[PDB]
Design a protein around this ligand. Structure first.
Ligand code: PEX
Ligand code: PEX
Ligand code: RTO
Ligand code: FZ4
Lengths: 594, 78, 95, 77
C-alpha cells in the first residue's frame, strides 16, 4: 500500500478500498504523517487530498482515514499535520475545509481533534505584492474573510474545541484586524466586511465579555480602528468611528445619540484612541503614518471633522502669531538685503536674521527628527529648512568676509518670500485656491524641464560646433542662453552672415523651435487632461488635511518649549468614556425619514 | 542694470509680456547668480500663468450656456 | 405658545427654524392630521394669522424652510396650498 | 511578454548604455572639432558605430519589408 495507491483512493472517495491500509501500516510500523506518504513538493498529507476532493459535500473516505491513524498509534495527528513548503507553510486540512465552503467536513475534523488554532504562515498567505491570499493565518480568520456565517459561529462555540477571537497570527493580527486588511473600498465588499465586523464583535460579547476585542494591538501597536486609518480604508474606518448599537450590545457602540429633535441630532462620539492627546492616535496616523490617497477624505468624517475644527479654533491665534513672526523676520531680511553695503542697525539686522536662521534651523531639524520614521506633504518643511541653512551659511560667510555671502543671502531672501505660501492654508479664501498647485501644477513643470534641458544641451553643443567656422554661440552657456530665449519669446532667429554654414545653422534653430513647441503642447495637454477628470470637492478636503497636519504640529508646541497636551472632550458615563459631543443638522436626511 | 525696485520690477514684468531681456550680463560680479534668479523667476511665473489658465479652464467645462441668456435678462431687468 | 430660543431662531449654526408656534411646527413637519386638528378643534383653535417673533406667519415659515430640492419643494407647495385653502373656511375675511 | 521582458531587460539597458557611450563620443568629437590622435580615434569609433547602426537598421528593414508610425524611431535610427 504505497503513496500512489493511497493518494488515488482518497481522491476517488471509496472507503471500501481503504481496508488494507491499516494492515500495511501495522506491518511496516509506519504512520500517515511519515514523509513517505507526503508529497515532497509542498508537504501535502493524505487527509489534505480528501478534503479538496469532495462529492455531495462529504467525502466518505475521511472518517475511515482518520480512525486508521488513531489505530496506528501516531504520536502526531494527521488532522493537525501542516505543509512544510516555504510558500504554503502551515497549510492544513482544516483550512481547505473552510475554503471549500463545506461545513460538514469542518464539523468532521474538529470532532476527531482538529486544532482550530493552526497557523498557515507560508509566503503564499503572507500579504505582499504578488501572488498571495492574505486572510489572517487562522481557520477562524479564514472563515471570517470568506462570508461563511455557519462556519464561523460553529468554530467559536463548538464544545470540542472553541476558537478564540483574541487569537493572533504571525503579525499579531486578530480576526478583526484581518477583516480590515481584506476590506476594499468597493461598496459590495465593504458591506460584507462591516456586517462580519459587527457580528463577530457582538458575538464576542457573549464568549469573552471580559476581553475588549477592539483594543487588541498587533505587533505594529495598531488597534483595528488605528489599522483602518493607516491602511487608508475609509469605508470600514467610518463605520467604527460612528458605530452605534441598541439593546444588550449598546456598550459596543462608539456613537451615543444624546437627543434628536427634527433635523438636529446630538451624538456623543468616543474619543478613545482617536484624540491626539495620546501618542500614536488615529489623528496622528492619518496625517503622518498613512500614505494612501484617501487620507484627505478621512479627516472630514465625524467626529474628526469637528474634533479638528475645535482644535483649529483654539490654535488659530497661534497660527497667525507664527505668521506674524515670520513676516517680521522677513521684513528685517528684506531691509537688510536691500541696505547691504546706519551700520549699527544693519549689524542688529544681521544678528536678528542670524538668530532667526538658527531658530528655523533648529525647529526644522527637530521636526525632521520626529518625522524620520515616515517621510510632497513635507514640501514646505524642506524649503523652510533650506532657507534656514542658507541664512546660517550666509551669515557664517559674512563673518569670514568672503564675497559669496551676498549670493547666499539673496537666495535666502528669495526662498523666504516663497515660503509664505505655507500660511495661505490658514484662510479659507487662500487655502482652497492654493490646493491645486502641489498636486498637479508643480509635478508636471518638472517633467518638461528635465526633457527640455537634455535637448537644450544637445542643440547648444551642435550650434557652437557648427558656428565655429566663419564665412555668436561661443560656448554651451551662451548657446544654451540663446536657445532658451525662444521659449520666453525673445529668441533672435536671424540669418547670420558671419557663419560659413549660415544656412544650416538656421535650419537647426528652426528645428529646435517646432521641436520645443512639441514639448510645450505635450505639457499643456498633460496639464489639460487632469482638469477635465478632477473633482472640486477634493480641494476642500485636501485643504482640511493641510489644516489637520498643521494643528497636530502646533499641539506639540515649539522646540524650545514643549507644551502640555490638552485632552478634548469630557469624561461622561455612557461605563464612562471621554466622549465628544457633536451637533449635526441634516434637513435632507430628516425629510427622507418623514 | 536693476538700479531700483521700480526698474527691477519693470524688467521682471517684461518676461510676462514676452519681452524680457534674459542675458548673461558681464558687468556684474555675481553674473552667474543673477541669471539663476532670472531663470527661477521664469518657471515660477509660468507656474502662476498655468494655475490661472487651469482655474479659468475648470469653470468652462462645468458651465451652462442657458445661464448666459438668463443673466442677460437680469441685467436688463435691473 | 412661542418657542423663541436661540435654538429655534434661524442663524448659521445648530438651529431648527420652523417658525415659533405649534401650528407652524405642525406645518414644517408633513403632519396633516395634526395641522387640521389644531386649526379646527373646539377646545382652542389655532389661527393662521398668528405671527412669531419675526412676524412670520405659517405661510412665511413654510417659505423659509423650503429648499430648492424637488422632494422638499413638492411637500412645501402641497402644504402651502392646503393651509391656504383651509384658511378660506376658518377665516374667509382675512387674506 | 512580461517574463520575456524580465529576461531581456538587461539586454535593453546594455543596448541603451552602448548608445549613450556612442553618443558621448559623438558629442565630444563634435565639440572638439578643429589631441588629434584621440580625435582620430573618436572619428573612427563614430565611423564604426555609424556602420553598425546602418547595417543593423538595413537588416531590420529587410526583415520588415513585408509589412511596413510604429517604425518611427527605426527610420530615424
Ligand atoms: C515678534 C517679533 C519676532 C522677531 C523675529 C524673531 C525670530 C522669528 C523666527 C521665525 O521666523 O520664526 C517662525 C516661527 C513660526 O514658524 P512655524 O513653526 O509655523 O514654521 C512652519 C514650517 N512649516 O515662529 C515661531 O516659532 C514663534 C516665534 C518665537 C519667538 C521666540 C523665540 C525664543 C527662542 C529662545
Ligand atoms: C560598451 C562600449 C561601446 C562603444 C560603442 C560601440 C558601438 C555601439 C554602436 C551603437 O550605438 O549601437 C547601439 C546598439 C543598440 O541599439 P538597438 O539595437 O537597441 O537599436 C534600436 C533601434 N530602434 O548596441 C548594440 O547593438 C550593442 C553594442 C554592440 C557592440 C559590439 C559590436 C561588434 C561588431 C562586430
Ligand atoms: C437639551 C435639548 C432638550 N430637547 C431638545 C429640544 C431642542 S428635548 O425636547 O428635551 C428632547 C428631545 C429629544 C430627545 C430624545 O430624542 O431623546 C430628548 C430630549
Ligand atoms: N481681496 C481678497 C481676495 O482673496 B482671495 C479669495 C477670495 C474669495 C474666495 C477665494 C479667494 C484670493 C486672492 C488671490 C489669490 C488667492 C485667493
Amino acid at each position: 500500500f504505497d503513496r500512489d495507491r493511497l493518494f488515488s483512493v482518497v481522491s476517488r472517495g471509496v472507503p471500501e478500498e481503504l481496508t488494507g491500509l491499516l494492515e500495511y501500516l501495522r506491518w511496516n510500523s509506519k504512520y500517515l504523517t511519515d514523509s513517505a506518504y507526503t508529497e515532497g513538493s509542498t508537504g501535502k498529507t493524505c487527509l489534505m487530498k480528501a478534503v479538496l476532493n469532495l462529492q455531495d459535500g462529504v467525502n466518505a473516505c475521511i472518517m475511515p482515514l482518520l480512525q486508521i491513524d488513531k489505530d496506528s498509534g501516531n504520536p502526531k495527528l494527521l488532522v493537525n499535520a501542516q505543509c512544510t513548503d516555504e510558500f504554503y507553510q502551515g497549510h492544513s486540512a482544516l483550512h481547505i475545509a473552510i475554503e471549500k465552503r463545506s461545513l460538514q467536513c469542518v464539523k468532521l475534523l474538529v470532532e476527531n481533534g482538529a486544532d482550530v488554532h493552526l497557523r498557515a504562515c507560508g509566503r503564499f498567505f503572507q500579504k505582499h505584492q504578488g501572488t498571495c491570499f492574505y486572510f489572517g493565518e487562522l481557520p477562524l480568520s479564514l472563515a471570517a474573510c470568506t462570508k461563511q456565517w455557519d462556519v464561523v459561529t460553529y468554530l467559536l462555540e463548538n464544545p470540542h474545541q472553541p476558537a478564540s477571537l483574541e487569537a493572533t497570527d504571525s503579525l499579531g493580527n486578530t480576526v478583526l484586524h484581518a477583516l480590515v486588511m481584506i476590506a476594499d473600498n468597493s461598496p459590495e465588499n465593504s458591506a460584507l466586511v462591516i456586517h462580519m465586523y459587527d457580528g463577530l464583535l457582538q458575538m464576542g460579547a457573549r464568549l469573552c465579555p471580559t476581553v475588549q476585542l477592539e483594543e487588541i494591538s498587533n505587533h505594529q501597536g495598531l488597534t483595528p480602528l488605528k489599522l483602518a486609518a493607516k491602511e487608508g480604508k475609509i469605508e470600514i474606518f467610518r463605520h467604527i468611528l460612528q458605530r452605534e448599537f441598541s439593546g444588550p450590545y449598546q456598550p459596543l457602540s462608539r456613537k451615543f445619540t444624546e437627543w434628536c429633535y427634527g433635523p438636529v441630532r446630538v451624538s456623543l462620539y468616543d474619543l478613545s484612541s482617536v484624540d491626539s492627546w495620546e501618542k500614536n492616535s488615529v489623528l496622528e496616523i492619518i496625517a503622518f503614518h498613512c500614505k494612501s490617497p484617501n487620507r484627505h477624505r478621512m479627516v472630514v468624517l465625524e467626529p474628526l471633522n469637528k474634533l479638528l475644527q475645535e482644535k483649529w479654533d483654539r490654535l488659530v491665534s497661534r497660527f497667525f502669531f507664527n505668521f506674524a513672526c515670520y513676516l517680521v523676520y522677513m521684513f528685517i531680511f528684506t531691509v537688510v538685503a536691500y541696505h547691504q553695503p546706519g551700520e549699527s542697525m544693519l549689524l542688529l539686522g544681521h544678528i536678528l536674521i542670524l538668530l532667526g536662521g538658527i531658530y528655523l534651523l533648529l525647529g526644522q531639524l527637530w521636526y525632521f527628527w520626529r518625522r524620520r520614521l515616515f517621510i510632497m506633504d513635507s514640501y514646505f518643511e524642506i524649503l523652510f529648512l533650506l532657507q534656514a541653512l542658507l541664512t546660517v551659511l550666509s551669515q557664517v560667510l559674512r563673518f569670514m568676509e568672503t564675497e559669496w555671502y551676498l549670493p547666499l543671502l539673496v537666495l535666502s531672501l528669495v526662498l523666504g518670500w516663497l515660503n509664505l505660501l505655507y500660511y495661505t492654508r490658514g484662510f479659507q479664501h487662500t487655502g482652497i485656491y492654493s490646493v491645486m498647485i502641489q498636486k498637479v501644477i508643480l509635478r508636471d513643470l518638472l517633467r518638461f524641464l528635465l526633457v527640455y534641458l537634455v535637448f537644450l544641451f544637445g542643440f547648444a553643443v551642435a550650434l557652437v560646433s557648427l558656428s565655429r567656422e566663419a564665412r555668436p554661440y561661443r560656448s554651451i552657456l551662451d548657446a544654451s542662453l540663446e536657445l532658451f530665449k525662444f521659449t520666453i519669446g525673445m529668441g533672435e532667429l536671424a540669418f547670420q552672415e558671419q557663419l560659413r554654414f549660415r544656412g544650416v545653422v538656421l535650419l537647426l534653430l528652426l528645428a529646435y523651435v517646432l521641436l520645443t513647441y512639441v514639448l510645450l503642447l505635450n505639457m499643456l495637454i498633460a496639464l489639460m487632461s487632469e482638469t477635465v477628470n478632477h473633482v472640486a470637492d477634493n480641494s476642500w478636503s485636501i485643504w482640511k488635511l493641510q489644516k489637520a497636519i498643521s494643528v497636530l504640529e502646533m499641539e506639540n508646541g515649539y522646540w524650545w518649549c514643549r507644551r502640555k497636551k490638552h485632552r478634548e472632550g469630557r469624561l461622561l458615563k455612557v461605563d464612562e468614556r471621554w466622549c465628544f459631543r457633536v451637533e449635526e443638522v441634516n434637513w435632507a436626511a430628516w425629510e427622507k425619514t418623514l
